[PDB]
Design a binder for this molecule. Structure first.
Ligand SMILES: CCCCCCSC[C@H](NC(=O)CC[C@H]([NH3+])C(=O)O)C(=O)NCC(=O)O
Ligand SMILES: CCCCCCSC[C@H](NC(=O)CC[C@H]([NH3+])C(=O)O)C(=O)NCC(=O)O
Ligand SMILES: [Zn+2]
Ligand SMILES: [Zn+2]
Lengths: 182, 177
């Protein structure tokens, strides 16, 4: 009589909610993910030195008191030298990470951002695909990176979670070994 | 402190170590209350493609991978499809914890009000005005239409859980402010 609790969708039910892309969305691309960072010096060091990303664009808004840092996995030789060409290229890349710095948070000892993995929840993490999780995590360990999940801990093996300087979670996985751990 | 100088920001950056060779930013994960609504929005409104669905019955959650990919490129065999779907750049992963659609008090937090953290994902499109005109026609919720507020030519829409989605035309930032 009473309707059953919803469980997960069947493959079919999920496909029934998917529509083919309209031709007007043809060239849309998912260009960025934005995270607010307390201290841009710490985040730039982490993203570039620990994860090997490149700072491709920096934008400052003096009246609004904030800066934007765009990071991506790009060859720094591809960064155009002319300013306007640089901006157009830096904002047209797939999978960019935008770090928003609100001026003054570095100096405020009672301030910190929320990573979304405790109430109230929403966003969970960003994820990196790497050639070898175990050597990647060995190097992370030698660098003093904080872990949320070590590769061989918990249910899923060969999968790790590390944290950036603000506490945001970062998935670490080897796409070519996931089928076997599923 | 005010903002970093350009010189200070670059000084804080290190060159890519050889041990990060081939690293790629593969996904952004968001929790969704209702997968039927989210799938409808990301495929029908945004034109994304569902490239992989994974269920975890013991843990009661599913994972929905979406990306701007040709659906003809999705490998046919299971193991090949998993490796391919987890190695695409710029994929959007949606986590559904089974049962949230039935809880009328439950809802995920979008990060744009205390406590803040994550703020938004962002789409680059060929024409912000024409994209937003279609979005309006479809009933999409807006935080900011292209000419609303200060920055012109830029918009923020919301998905079914309230997450902000930036809509931008990278070849038009001169008219931004
Ligand atoms: C290279 C330039 C890239 C495009 C520039 C767009 S910045 C978008 C703008 N970002 C901000 O204001 C960030 C600072 C803000 N204090 C915050 O923490 O969110 C915003 O959310 N606006 C949303 C709103 O108006 O509500
Ligand atoms: C095709 C496989 C792709 C990779 C599968 C990994 S899902 C990772 C796993 N995710 C979840 O548990 C999601 C459900 C969870 N109840 C939530 O809301 O976050 C987790 O955070 N684990 C983190 C931890 O151990 O803390
Ligand atoms: Zn943004
Ligand atoms: Zn994930």
């Amino acid at each position: 009589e009473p309707q059953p609790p919803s469980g997960g969708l069947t493959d079919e039910a999920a496909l029934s909610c998917c529509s083919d892309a309209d031709p007007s969305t043809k060239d849309f691309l998912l260009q960025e993910t934005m995270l607010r960072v307390k201290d841009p010096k710490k985040s730039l060091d982490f993203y570039t030195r620990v994860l090997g990303m490149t700072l491709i664009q920096k934008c400052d808004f003096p009246i609004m008191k904030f800066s934007l840092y765009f990071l991506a996995y790009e060859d720094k030789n591809d960064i155009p030298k002319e300013k306007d060409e640089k901006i157009a290229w830096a904002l047209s890349r797939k999978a960019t990470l935008e770090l928003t710095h609100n001026w003054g948070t570095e100096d405020d000892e009672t301030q910190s951002y929320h990573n979304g993995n405790s109430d109230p929840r929403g966003f969970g993490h960003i994820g990196i695909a790497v050639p070898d999780v175990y050597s990647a995590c060995k190097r992370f360990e030698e660098l003093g990176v904080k872990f949320v999940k070590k590769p061989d801990d918990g249910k899923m093996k060969g999968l790790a979670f590390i944290q950036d300087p603000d506490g945001y979670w970062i998935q670490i996985l080897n796409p070519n070994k996931m089928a076997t751990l599923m």
